Design a protein around this ligand. Sequence first.
Ligand SMILES: NCCCCOc1ccc(S(N)(=O)=O)cc1
Ligand SMILES: NCCCCOc1ccc(S(N)(=O)=O)cc1
Ligand SMILES: [Zn+2]
Length: 257
Amino acid sequence: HWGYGKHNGPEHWHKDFPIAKGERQSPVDIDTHTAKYDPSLKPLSVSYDQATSLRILNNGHAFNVEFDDSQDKAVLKGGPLDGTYRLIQFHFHWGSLDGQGSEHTVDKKKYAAELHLVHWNTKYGDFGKAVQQPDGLAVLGIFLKVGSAKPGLQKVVDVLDSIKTKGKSADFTNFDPRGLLPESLDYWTYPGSLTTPPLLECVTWIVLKEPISVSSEQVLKFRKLNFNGEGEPEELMVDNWRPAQPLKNRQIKASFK
Ligand SMILES: NCCCCOc1ccc(S(N)(=O)=O)cc1
Ligand SMILES: NCCCCOc1ccc(S(N)(=O)=O)cc1
Ligand SMILES: [Zn+2]
């Protein structure tokens, strides 16, 4: 199975997922001087007041916090988007060291981690159908830097002991993802892909300019998770990020000057 190790990592993925070498792969480096301000970009509309979180799962590559997406409860609209995108899950990518972990980079700078809030276009009915469309998903990407603690992240950190290994899940109701956002909703946007297999080219990426800060203890607890299942040799879940891919025939637009 694909992974992040030397023998099954990002360099290998193209052999089973040839779209790895495609025209709109993610993540990418965001060159801030080359991105263009687009005054026609609308403000993001993040409407999470009615979010219903259900469960947290170690899926062997990261942990997902899952939401009830059977109604318009937590949705993303506006910005570059046409229509309404429902929150289905969020997850993170992170490093073994504070100087790496993010998937997107900014002027080649790597953050300690990156949060992905994953949404699907309600005109396609369900997530499985959405990922087969060029405008199927909207992923909101938020950089994490190490500094002061993020209070709204702590309930996530404290449950990770109960989902240490692959396939473990825990009830995770009443979590408010609004606590994970920075102050500003200024963003960059570009057309891209899932950053894990199957690497489908179905994502409108919206990457916030302002990182959130998390504490060293918070990200240390991420690093104590396991890629492996219970009773298997322990492999710490670290460096579960794909490096920047060629931008090719794309331009990154900015919502701000
Ligand atoms: N030397 C043996 C290594 C074992 C792993 O083999 C793999 C070979 C390829 C993949 S892929 N194309 O899904 O990333 C995953 C695992
Ligand atoms: N067709 C099944 C798809 C399963 C994977 O779902 C993903 C959903 C989001 C991402 S990412 N890192 O681009 O936000 C990766 C994978
Ligand atoms: Zn992701």
